[PDB]
Design a binder for this molecule. Structure first.
Ligand code: CL
Ligand code: NA
Length: 246
């Protein structure tokens, strides 16, 4: 009956945010543009940063479920908490849409990532697996124009559950006509991407960790850790050489 053999990767699932695009940095540039607006146009002082930081936290505390309203309100609340006064929706909308336009303008696929994705697609299925609200993620995808690189795109806000729930990963596999055991997840977040891949029994999880710092407490343990998605082909190539029982 049984024998040694190889088992090639058939599909790679990629995060979008902070994996393929610099969401973190694009977002800092947005906040810098809002600070510039508030300081020059509205003569804010160090309050400008306080407000932006407040909104960063508020953003980070959103729950998975009308995003423009929600996000404009973050701004409204943050301005009111800092500056007092009645609600200022027009200033909040100015800030919000400036943060939003700026960050989207700065979301781009690097040329070397384009070339890597193009090359990889010859050999494996590529799927974009991205958590977040449908509108927001779609706007990101359109801004960095990455749709043409992927066999499929799955957005968590369009599904019953998102990462790390294993169901979304099984949906990805079904879309591609592959098994979880054939798929590699690549992403920069332990609690969603990595745990999610572990939950779903994926062939491997690859943690993108630019800094290289590892946590000190219990956490999901990825199979691999790399600085950049550009290190992925070698890993895949090496996975494709691993011997296991038939
Ligand atoms: Cl976001
Ligand atoms: Na991410």
């Amino acid at each position: 009956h049984h024998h040694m053999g190889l088992s090639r990767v058939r599909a790679v699932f990629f995060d979008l945010d902070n994996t393929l695009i610099d969401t973190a940095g694009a977002s800092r540039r947005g906040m810098l543009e809002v600070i510039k607006l508030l300081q020059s146009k509205y003569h804010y002082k160090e309050e400008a940063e306080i407000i932006c930081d407040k909104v960063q936290v508020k953003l980070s505390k959103e729950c998975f479920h009308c995003i423009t309203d929600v996000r404009t309100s973050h701004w409204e609340e943050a301005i009111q908490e800092t500056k007092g006064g009645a609600d200022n929706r027009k200033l909040a909308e100015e800030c919000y849409f400036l943060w939003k336009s700026t960050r989207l303008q700065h979301m781009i696929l690097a040329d070397d990532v384009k070339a890597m994705l193009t090359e990889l697609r010859k050999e494996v299925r590529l799927l974009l697996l991205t958590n977040g609200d449908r509108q927001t993620q779609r706007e990101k995808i359109e801004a960095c124009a990455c749709q043409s690189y992927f066999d499929a795109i799955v957005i968590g806000g369009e599904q019953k559950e998102e990462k790390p729930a294993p169901s979304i990963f099984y949906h990805c596999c079904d879309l591609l006509g592959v098994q979880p055991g054939d798929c590699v997840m690549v992403g920069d977040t332990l609690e969603t991407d990595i745990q999610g891949g572990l939950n779903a029994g994926l062939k491997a999880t690859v943690w993108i960790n630019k800094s290289g710092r590892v946590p000190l407490t219990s956490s999901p343990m990825p199979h691999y850790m790399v600085s950049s998605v550009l290190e992925l082909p070698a890993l895949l190539q090496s996975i494709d050489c691993k011997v296991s029982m038939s």
